[PDB]
Design a protein around this ligand. Structure first.
Ligand code: CDL
Ligand code: CDL
Ligand code: PEF
Ligand code: PEF
Ligand code: PEF
Ligand code: PEF
Ligand code: HEM
Ligand code: HEM
Ligand code: HEM
Ligand code: HEM
Ligand code: UQ6
Lengths: 57, 126, 248, 385, 93, 385, 93
């Protein structure tokens, strides 16, 4: 639905910068957590997180 | 930097001798063909650099039509190289029409410049 | 440039921690330190790592202390100026067993024992090279080769003469369970440990590198697109010549 | 009149950045040079942030670097970035010079630019050597001793000048303190020289890759070329990240990570990758004075490349023999570096000596004779009678 | 500012290049152009033709120096292989 | 055309040293500004040759100063010249300021110049404090502690920023290391700002002492004013020699020569003489945030001087009341400094408060009302009806 | 070159000052006259005239602040001189 509504949403430069900054914030957060999750579960038995659980008895 | 007086002398000496001409004309033709500038749309009367003041005097002597045509060819070459393509095989500069139009306007001024640089250091004579 | 003076070129072992997306197998650093402390003992130094960085990487919180109170560090004097020894704390380095330098050259029967804290980052190749040195000793000295007394042979050391023997035998560590009596195991543990101690920043470095490479790849492709975009206003302009009227 | 051309502090930036009529046919190498400058500035910034946490003694210099690489929040990134940014700086420096040689930029209009550039080159080599001495590793100390003893070749004043610059009979506290202070100072002089390079450049603009006059059409820097520099620097940043994270120790050697010890020397003493060509020619000619003079000769030859080439047609896009010889020259350079890195043995000495001969000959004699052949062939082929 | 020396390039409006007439440059504007008009045909065909047209100029030097380096290396390790008394001493010494 | 005005590297120097039509009626204050420039350059040079032999660790910073004092051949001259040239530089900069304020150079056509200058002023104050910390004597440590803690007056989050700038929870290796590195960095930024200062100056010449148009006649730069600079710089050299040889420890205070000891502090801790004026107003008003803001407010109230001096007649060469008030203000300034130096007791709190009041009052309200009275008197005197 | 903003001072020849006619200047060259003319007479006489002209502008402020400084010093001295139990307390607060 790329009608004139998005052009009017992009017309104001200040709201453009506000939106780009908010997107940067949310992107930073979600991208960082996703990358950490992928890096972590990719190594079962390697990282300290589960090693300390295993040594726990 | 190297004057065209020496180049013209060497060229006339090579061309006058018949056996050396038969030896060097075919290699010259094949060289200028592989040179890679006929296709993209350049006459050799433009490739010569334009920093020496003698070149400025040479261009200032050109008639209007040749200067305009040279401008068109050089800008078109700029654009075509920017595109990374080559021109279509219809406007490739044909071999028989690579006429020298600018060489005399270099030599005519080069002779004057040489004799100017010489005549200052004249002697009292006898 | 003979082969004897240069030593065997290092092989291409299939490491466990190698690879662009792999961390350490530091379920074994926990025992690599154990075997290192057992067998290296009072020979090599390792005097560049602080007991506040083996916590949360190989040891949980309190074991590091529970061995730190087994050393001495010679801290500030009392009211009478007599220097005092107190048990170690959590922010103090491991003591190199040989006091300053001289006992080292008095006990090794030879040259200085090189510092292990950065050794495997400071040799050609190196990730495998330490493994090759540790396992490369032939069980019988080579025949028909001169060798000075005391030093033992090496087909991997450049020059083929090492001042240290091969104390890497079997059934002499016994970490916690059934695993030792395989000298390859102790060699693997110690090399992983030393590769960690050369840079206690492997995991974080790899993660940050992955993040940066993803961000940069995306940014680079976007830049390609934008260059194709706003440069397209001139990469397609067309010129048409007209012969000007010949009048002057 | 627009404010972009009224305020002087901004009029300058306009004339050099916002609006400057670059030529239309520019290829990626000019952006390569701009990327080079930006590499310089990021190197300077991270160097300052490095030095804020660096000691300067000789018993407490290695400890400082291990401290900055291991025991400071987000530190090792700084140290690897400085090192590999320097290495990439030398890569791009050599690339910029090679472009200059190839496309006819060194010719008459910008001889001053060429001179300032080669001055920047020798300055940069000095800076890199100074910094490489600042670490005081194992081989770095030997390199410092060798270079500070190079000047002993000069007759009469051979022991006084070294005793002055070296500040002592042996490498000790004054030597390293002096080296570090100079290593800090001289990059700012490089920045001043960069400003001079820009001023000498803008007087006549850049050159066409075709070797043709660029006074016909032009397009401004910003909104056209700023994006090109942006894309090429994104490529550089990603490759530098690949090095600084995935494989850190590939553009160097694993000997700097060794405490300084003036008792033993490594099996092979080698400079960093960007000096091997200027090290092979030292083992080439076995006269001390000859080597010391021939290094600066290898630079002065770059100085004297102008008014040596005498083809009336600029550039080497349209001269097959000339460009083929240029390629054999660049492979000569890489072979020279490689033959330097390998040891001095029976075939290698002949290899290196022949390499030096053909290298200096290409600069001196190959270029003029080939140029004259090219000019005469062009003159005779297109003319008939 | 003080007057400066003669220069072959100026600023906008006084480029100083030869005066031209009859040239008529066009444009299309970047928004209504669909940037990647040619993105696979142009890529593959132009890349391969350009690689063909400038192939020898790097093959010949690289091959020459690779052959040279291989010969040098093979002679070097032939020297230090059961030949240090008969071949080494006749050139090295 | 003359080679002096053709080559770019020399066409630049021509328009700034060889041909710059200064006004006819120059007096010694602009020669004094040239003196200031030369003081800066000699400070930079001797600083380089100082850091050539200076360590950086906290434990080996004082020992480094004694080492530069004696154990280096002809070195005490370097250290004393550095310190006393810095103090003389600050005095001459203050006199440059007072000159500028008196003669009305801050009139509108040079507001950019004046703003850039006051930026150099604040930068230079920062540099002086940084170096004085670099010494790390006894009271310099407390001065660093207080001035770092100054930022804790920032509302809400104030402890995090000070702990960040202060390298931890104690004055230790990172503190002095960063302070010294920044001190060694900043003067080059000063050099950049002063080349901007020259750029901004050249747009519209220099003001007449008469406060009137100087476009009528001017005399060339070189061979006339170079010697007016030479005489004053020779005076500077001789007075600096007098203060560096016969009377070394007068301008500074004899307290720096103590090892750092964060356990005992003397009851008499004061800044060096050129920071007393602001220290007085800081200790004057009885608040933390008020003082912290009012220092930079003194700098800002300096800033506000243009578009406030509403005299249609430039300068204070023909206004008896205005020049009398300027003299009361400069004597105010020196009184402020001296009372800051003296201890605070019963008869001094009121003295200092009144001093600050008249100071800021002169900046804000004294100039406009007095100027308006002068203008209206000038109109009324020479008009009939 | 790139044109810049308007400036209130040109260079030689286009200096920008008001045009004038009839003004005549002179000179006698440095070598044809004694460098030190007046040296003492002008020194003493002009020095005293100048010092007389502006004496009060520096005399008055200095006197005022000297009077303040003297009064402050004397009161401070009196404060801590056998008066710390009968005058210091009643004014310190
Ligand atoms: C990578 C290794 C080599 C890098 C060398 C440096 C390249 C460089 O500086 O940039 C030039 C860069 C752009 O060229 P240009 O200077 O703009 O145009 C001149 C063309 O060469 C004119 O010639 P052409 O275009 O006919 O042929 C070149 C062709 C070559 O391109 C290829 O197809 C590469 C394979 C053949 C070439 C092999 C290497 C040479 O280039 C293209 O196809 C244009 C770029 C196509 C990609 C468009 C992407 C659109 C945006 C996508 C956004 C996705 C967002 C995802 C989420 C974030 O050329 C590339 O395409 C190389 C980068 C792409 C690598 C992809 C992996
Ligand atoms: C290790 C440290 C590495 C540090 C790297 C720093 C960044 C490097 C950036 C390289 C760069 O700017 O490449 C320029 C850029 C040169 O292409 P351009 O910008 O069109 O300039 C034309 C050339 O001067 C050549 O003119 P042409 O149109 O005859 O092109 C023939 C093409 C020959 O290459 C091909 O025919 C394409 C197939 C190659 C695979 O030659 C190349 O440019 C190949 C160089 C790259 C391979 O690289 C490419 O070749 C673009 C991809 C196509
Ligand atoms: C990318 C550059 C890699 C540099 C490098 O790899 O530096 C190391 C190699 C040495 O080769 P090596 O086998 O002796 O390394 C053995 C130790 N692992 O130097 C080179 O090849 C230099 C060749 C080019 C030098 C001049 C280049 C100028 C352009
Ligand atoms: C993982 C391994 C990947 C291998 C392939 C790497 C990428 C190579 C792609 C080469 C495409 C074939 C050459 C052009 C053929 C062609 O033109 O076919 C038609 C189209 C593009 O036509 P056009 O718009 O360019 O015509 C332009 C002139 N009117 O092609 C494609 O859309 C191929 C899409 C799949 C890829
Ligand atoms: C500089 C003059 C010499 C300084 C000096 O001679 O000493 C330092 C004096 C105070 O020293 P003091 O009077 O407190 O006596 C203690 C030392 N024996 O600075 C002043 O307050 C006068 C100048 C500061 C205010 C004016 C600033 C001018 C710009
Ligand atoms: C150590 C203590 C020294 C104390 C004195 C310091 C110097 C004071 C000088 C005052 C001189 C007297 C007043 C001027 C008289 C005068 O002008 O007499 C005439 C000459 C110079 O006149 P003129 O030719 O320049 O006039 C130029 C136009 N007719 O003067 C002297 O040659 C004085 C010589 C003694 C010194
Ligand atoms: C700090 C290092 C340097 C910087 C920052 C620098 C900067 C620049 C810049 C900005 C340009 C314009 C386009 C480009 O970016 O390439 C340029 C061009 C050029 N530089 Fe440099 N340069 C440096 C080193 C050198 C050196 C060492 C030389 C030569 C020895 C040199 C010679 C040239 C030449 C010949 C051009 C030609 C441009 C043309 O022909 O179109 N530069 N340089
Ligand atoms: C001007 C600011 C700079 C500072 C403060 C600085 C500081 C440093 C420091 C502290 C080191 C490491 C010291 C050591 O290892 O003991 C270093 C290394 C180095 N610097 Fe710089 N540097 C600066 C600029 C530059 C520049 C401009 C270059 C080159 C373009 C450069 C090239 C190097 C190199 C090659 C090393 C390698 C040695 C090592 O890896 O540490 N530096 N620098
Ligand atoms: C390193 C610092 C500085 C340098 C090198 C410098 C240099 C100069 C120079 C060369 C001049 C020309 C006349 C003269 O020499 O005095 C000048 C004039 C001037 N400077 Fe500075 N200056 C510096 C700092 C400042 C500061 C901090 C200010 C003001 C906050 C300032 C304000 C002025 C003004 C107002 C003039 C006016 C000249 C006129 O009106 O006749 N300067 N300066
Ligand atoms: C105009 C700018 C500068 C000023 C006003 C300045 C001022 C000072 C002052 C006041 C000190 C204290 C020294 C003392 O207590 O005796 C000092 C110390 C020092 N400055 Fe600077 N400085 C300046 C620029 C520089 C530069 C550019 C360098 C180095 C290149 C430098 C290096 C030093 C060093 C090494 C010390 C050591 C402390 C000492 O030994 O006492 N300074 N500076
Ligand atoms: C031992 O094995 C070797 C080896 O054989 C070789 C060749 C090299 C290669 C080394 C070199 C080629 C050395 C080159 C280094 C230099 C030439 C640097 C020499 C030092 C300087 C030139 C100091 C420069 C410092 C300055 C302050 C310059 C002075 C500045 C001036 C005059 C400008 C003044 C400023 C103004 C504004 C006027 C090695 O590194 C090496 O070790 C592995």
């Amino acid at each position: 639905s790329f009608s004139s509504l998005y052009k009017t949403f992009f017309k104001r430069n200040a709201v453009f910068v506000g939106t780009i900054f908010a997107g940067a914030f949310v992107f930073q957060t979600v991208f960082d957590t996703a990358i950490t999750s992928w890096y972590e579960n990719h190594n079962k038995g390697k990282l300290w997180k589960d090693v300390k659980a295993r040594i726990a008895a | 930097p190297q004057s065209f007086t020496s180049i013209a002398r060497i060229g006339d000496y090579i061309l006058k001798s018949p056996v050396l001409s038969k030896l060097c004309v075919p290699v010259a033709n094949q060289f200028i063909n592989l040179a890679g500038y006929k296709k993209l749309g350049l006459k050799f009367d433009d490739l010569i650099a334009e920093e020496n003041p003698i070149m400025q005097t040479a261009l200032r002597r050109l008639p209007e039509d040749e200067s305009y045509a040279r401008a068109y060819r050089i800008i078109r070459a700029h654009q075509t190289e920017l595109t990374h393509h080559l021109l279509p095989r219809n406007e490739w500069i044909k071999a028989q029409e690579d006429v020298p139009y600018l060489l005399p306007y270099i030599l005519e001024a080069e002779a004057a410049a040489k004799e100017k640089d010489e005549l200052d250091n004249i002697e009292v004579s006898k | 440039m003979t082969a004897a003076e240069h030593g065997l070129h290092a092989p291409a072992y299939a490491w466990s921690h190698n690879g662009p997306f792999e961390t350490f197998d530091h379920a074994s650093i926990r025992r690599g330190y154990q075997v290192y402390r057992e067998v290296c003992a009072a020979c090599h130094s390792l005097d560049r790592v602080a007991w506040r960085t083996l916590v949360g990487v190989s040891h949980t919180n309190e074991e590091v202390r529970n061995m730190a109170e087994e050393f001495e560090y010679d801290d500030e004097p009392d009211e009478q100026g007599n220097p005092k020894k107190r048990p170690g704390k959590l922010s103090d380095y491991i003591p190199g067993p040989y006091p300053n330098e001289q006992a080292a050259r008095a006990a090794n029967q030879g040259a200085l024992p090189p510092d292990l804290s950065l050794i495997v980052k400071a040799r050609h190749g190196g990730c495998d090279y330490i493994f090759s040195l540790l396992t490369g000793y032939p069980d019988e000295p080579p025949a028909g080769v001169a060798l000075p007394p005391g030093s033992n042979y090496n087909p991997y050391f450049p020059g083929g003469s090492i001042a240290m023997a091969r104390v890497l035998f079997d059934d002499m560590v016994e970490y916690e369970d059934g695993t030792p009596a395989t000298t390859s195991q102790m060699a693997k543990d110690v090399t992983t440990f030393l590769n960690w101690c050369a840079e206690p920043e492997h995991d974080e470095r790899k993660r940050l590198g992955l993040k940066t490479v993803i961000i940069l790849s995306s940014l680079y492709l976007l830049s390609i697109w934008v260059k194709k975009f706003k440069w397209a206003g001139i990469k397609t302009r067309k010129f048409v010549f007209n012969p000007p009227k010949p009048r002057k | 009149m627009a404010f972009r051309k009224s305020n002087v502090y901004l009029s300058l930036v306009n004339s050099y950045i916002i609006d400057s009529p670059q030529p239309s046919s520019i290829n990626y190498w000019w952006n390569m040079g701009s990327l080079l400058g930006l590499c310089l500035v990021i190197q300077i910034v991270t160097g300052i942030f490095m030095a804020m946490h660096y000691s300067s003694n000789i018993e407490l210099a290695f400890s400082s670097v291990e401290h900055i690489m291991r025991d400071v929040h987000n530190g090792y990134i700084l140290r690897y970035l400085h090192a590999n940014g320097a290495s990439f700086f030398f890569m791009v420096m050599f690339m910029h010079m090679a472009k200059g040689l190839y496309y006819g930029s060194y010719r008459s209009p910008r001889v001053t630019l060429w001179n300032v550039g080669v001055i920047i080159f020798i300055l940069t080599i000095a800076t890199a050597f100074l910094g490489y001495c600042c670490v005081y590793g194992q081989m770095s100390h030997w390199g410092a001793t060798v270079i500070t003893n190079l000047f002993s070749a000069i007759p009469f004043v051979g022991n006084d000048i070294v005793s002055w610059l070296w500040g002592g009979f042996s490498v000790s506290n004054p030597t390293i303190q002096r080296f570090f202070a100079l290593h800090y100072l001289v990059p700012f002089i490089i920045a001043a020289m960069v400003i001079m390079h820009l001023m000498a450049l803008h007087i006549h603009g850049s050159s066409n890759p075709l070797g043709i006059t660029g006074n016909l059409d032009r397009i401004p820097m910003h909104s056209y070329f700023i994006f090109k520099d942006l894309v090429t620097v994104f490529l550089f940043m990603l490759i530098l990240a690949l090095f600084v994270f995935y494989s850190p120790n590939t553009l160097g050697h694993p000997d700097n990570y060794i405490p300084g010890n003036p008792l033993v020397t490594p099996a092979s003493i080698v400079p960093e990758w960007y000096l091997l060509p200027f090290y092979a020619i030292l083992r080439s000619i076995p006269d001390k004075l000859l080597g010391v003079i021939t290094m600066f000769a290898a630079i002065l030859v770059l100085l004297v490349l102008p008014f040596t080439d005498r083809s009336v047609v600029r550039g080497n896009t349209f001269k097959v023999l000339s460009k083929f010889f240029f390629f054999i020259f660049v492979f000569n350079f890489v072979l020279l570096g490689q033959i330097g890195a390998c040891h001095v043995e029976v075939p290698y000495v002949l290899m290196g000596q022949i390499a030096t001969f053909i290298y200096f000959a290409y600069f001196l004699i190959i270029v003029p004779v080939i140029s004259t052949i090219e000019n005469v062939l062009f003159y005779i082929g297109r003319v008939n009678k | 500012g003080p007057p400066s020396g003669k220069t072959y390039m100026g600023w906008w409006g006084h480029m100083g290049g030869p005066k031209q007439k009859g040239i008529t440059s066009y444009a299309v504007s970047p928004y209504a152009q669909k940037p990647l008009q040619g993105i696979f045909h142009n890529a593959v065909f132009n890349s391969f033709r350009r690689f063909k047209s400038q192939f020898l100029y790097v093959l010949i030097p690289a091959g020459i120096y690779w052959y040279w380096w291989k010969n040098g290396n093979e002679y070097n390790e032939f020297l230090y292989s059961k030949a240090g008394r008969e071949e080494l001493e006749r050139v090295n010494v």
